[PDB]
Symmetry: D2
Amino acid sequence: KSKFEYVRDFEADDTCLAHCWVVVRLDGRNFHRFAEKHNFAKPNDSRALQLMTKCAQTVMEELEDIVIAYGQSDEYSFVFKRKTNWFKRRASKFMTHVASQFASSYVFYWRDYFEDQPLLYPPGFDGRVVVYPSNQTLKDYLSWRQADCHINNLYNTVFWALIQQSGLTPVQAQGRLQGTLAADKNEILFSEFNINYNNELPMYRKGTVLIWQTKPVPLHCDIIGDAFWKEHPEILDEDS
Amino acid sequence: KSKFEYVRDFEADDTCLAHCWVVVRLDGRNFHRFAEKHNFAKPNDSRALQLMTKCAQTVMEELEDIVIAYGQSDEYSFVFKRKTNWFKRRASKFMTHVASQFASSYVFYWRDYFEDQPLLYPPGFDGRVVVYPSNQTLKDYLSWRQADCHINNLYNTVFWALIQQSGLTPVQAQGRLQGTLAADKNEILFSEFNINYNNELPMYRKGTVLIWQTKPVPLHCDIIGDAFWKEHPEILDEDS
Amino acid sequence: KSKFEYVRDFEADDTCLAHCWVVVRLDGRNFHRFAEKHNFAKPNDSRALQLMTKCAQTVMEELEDIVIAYGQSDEYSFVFKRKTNWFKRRASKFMTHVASQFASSYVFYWRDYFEDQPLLYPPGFDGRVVVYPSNQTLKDYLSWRQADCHINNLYNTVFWALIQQSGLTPVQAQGRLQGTLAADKNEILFSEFNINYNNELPMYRKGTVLIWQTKPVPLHCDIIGDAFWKEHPEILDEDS
Amino acid sequence: KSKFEYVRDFEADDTCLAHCWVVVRLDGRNFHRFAEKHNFAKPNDSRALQLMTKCAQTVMEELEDIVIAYGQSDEYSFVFKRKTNWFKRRASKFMTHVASQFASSYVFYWRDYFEDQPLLYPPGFDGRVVVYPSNQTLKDYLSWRQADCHINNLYNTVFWALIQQSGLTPVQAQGRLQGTLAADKNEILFSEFNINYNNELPMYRKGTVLIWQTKPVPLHCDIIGDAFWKEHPEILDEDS
């Protein structure tokens, strides 16, 4: 009917390969500018990070089949169990339901974390869907993101200390850090600022992992090693 | 030498066929419940509708290459010009940037339309991407959505009149309307409720179209006929 | 400055999910008619089957990264190792190179198997590509095809015996076999035709597997059990 | 049933955008070597070209919904009408049925064109599927291929004349031709070899077009201009 209904023929199938892990990853859009305009503390800002996590919790509570989420900096990844058929496994549905629910929550709960700082404008989020064929590839993905958190936090902590405390210019801080190794960065934090990196808050060092324990609770533990997985076998062991 | 970086190989290309119209369509998620919980007026609620449009305007102003938007009820469609290469024409990018920016705006500008009614929880939105190969198919798509607005508004107007004014039960209203034709519904509104359907507000009857005139201005005109397109030839005539 | 070159923009990416098994499966097109027209012996014809295998061998020798092939009746499946990047893993390339090389070989080597029977016309082949995320799914796929060979050979052997030896009409044969179980079919072959099914040629019962031993050698063994895989661990154990 | 049947869930949809032109293009695989080994005459070999065309005719006769084919050098393109639903418009089916039927025919009819030259080995063919959204884009595609034929034949004719008649070395011929314009190449053919390019056989200059007139007949006419299309309006005018 309608005579215009034929246009439905143009919708294409975007089904995610069956019995595989489906991950939706979100990145705040132009959050470098968003951070500036909202006076985000460098190198880490607890308000921003906890707001993100609160949004991830909401996504996990409102959508379905998400078994684990991992967030750090301006990103959050959501893993849907592989036997899911939530929306016939259509990529577009995973993407938009996660992206929209997250964004609405970001604004909705903003005041709970930024009681004094006013939200200047509704932000946007970049999103993508990736399918991982195995438990090992999924874990490697999560390790990839956690390792990224580590690399960036170490760099940023020493970088901002050089600026905010040593008085160096952004360009000077960068030059001093170029070519430096992990051990070097640690030595600089210790010698020049009397900072023990390993004592920095767990959230800033490892990021945040959300799992069902029922409600999604936050943890700032290592997920690269086996310990985490051996202790929460229900996640990867699930059927299909 | 990351070692986990190989997981990048899993990202798949979701490029939209070149030189074609790209449409992102959004639908409020479970908005039947959202409407109930927020006391939306039936059959039409100006607050809700105008908030949606405000969101569409924000999406058009913050993203790029959107030449026309059309909304009605709990939906809104965004048309990206066919020569766009905004994000290498990746479907996921169109989807998430539109969905997220729309959702954050929905919460952000809520009070501007629901000054008294409080927002009980951050809503989610359903989204999809469709590629239309020609100007005629794109027009037919828009006509399909506008015709949908007409069909539903006529049905809902008489439906809610039977309930809110005749005292019929939802089930009775439905029974009375089954098998009825468009002319019949019009007759019922006129005879039993002294309602001239054609005099109902334009926004409720035709929905809202957004085009650049620069800023995106709202119009509640017919877009099925040629009149609209002959008057705004810049939209379909653009290169590529 | 060609001016027509822009049509290249329309080519779409059809890359197969990285680090996964890629299978190309071929089916002779309308081979029921081809078999009739070329006097194929029923229920099995060694000429046809061995010609197919010869073709599979040529596909494995001329293309690259194929680690195992399995054929039966009018089909043949080719498995490409998962670390292959042969053609950027484009589905179309796997499909056409396999399909074309197979078809040309079918005609080229025809006389080597049908020395007297003349080829009446060049046949066509149906083809498809499927990506299997794991070793178990790939094995289950091969088992699915071998089991198919078993089910059909048992059915066809008793079916053609009822016709070619009992004088039943095709429709009568079918009626007699409807509702029958595997054991029943075995009983019928034994009692009424003095045929011990398990003694039928291995090729007809299990089909043909091709693996590198270098050249691709034919084997008519079971591949559903673990025996085959434990003995040829190089196939599934390969990197990536 | 089967227990292995679940593997069917892995097959992905590869449907071509509805109501659009579907083109399957084939390129002989490593035909530079094939030409050498079979003593193909340079710059053009009538046997090779006519064999290709014979194969294209067979593809058009055995498959369905192909309305026009265009071939030149070692390639052939097949255009399927846009309202086709032959195989649910699955790319893989267009690809493999065209590639296989073509290849089997190439071998089958080889002797009809190479009566003395023996076929040393069964060749392979590269294949691809492209979807064109409009009549204009389809025509531009065909013009792109015909123009390519022109460009290459002009270059090759003068190139091989320089070698085969002027005694230049391949590397010298190339150097002399670098930087030369169309008019220059024409001047060289005329002045040095007394060759009027425009008098070369139509097949070598324009290639071959196949259309239904019913059977697919060969034509060596221009298809870049409107003349051809105005005279055979049935092709682009067909419904959908």
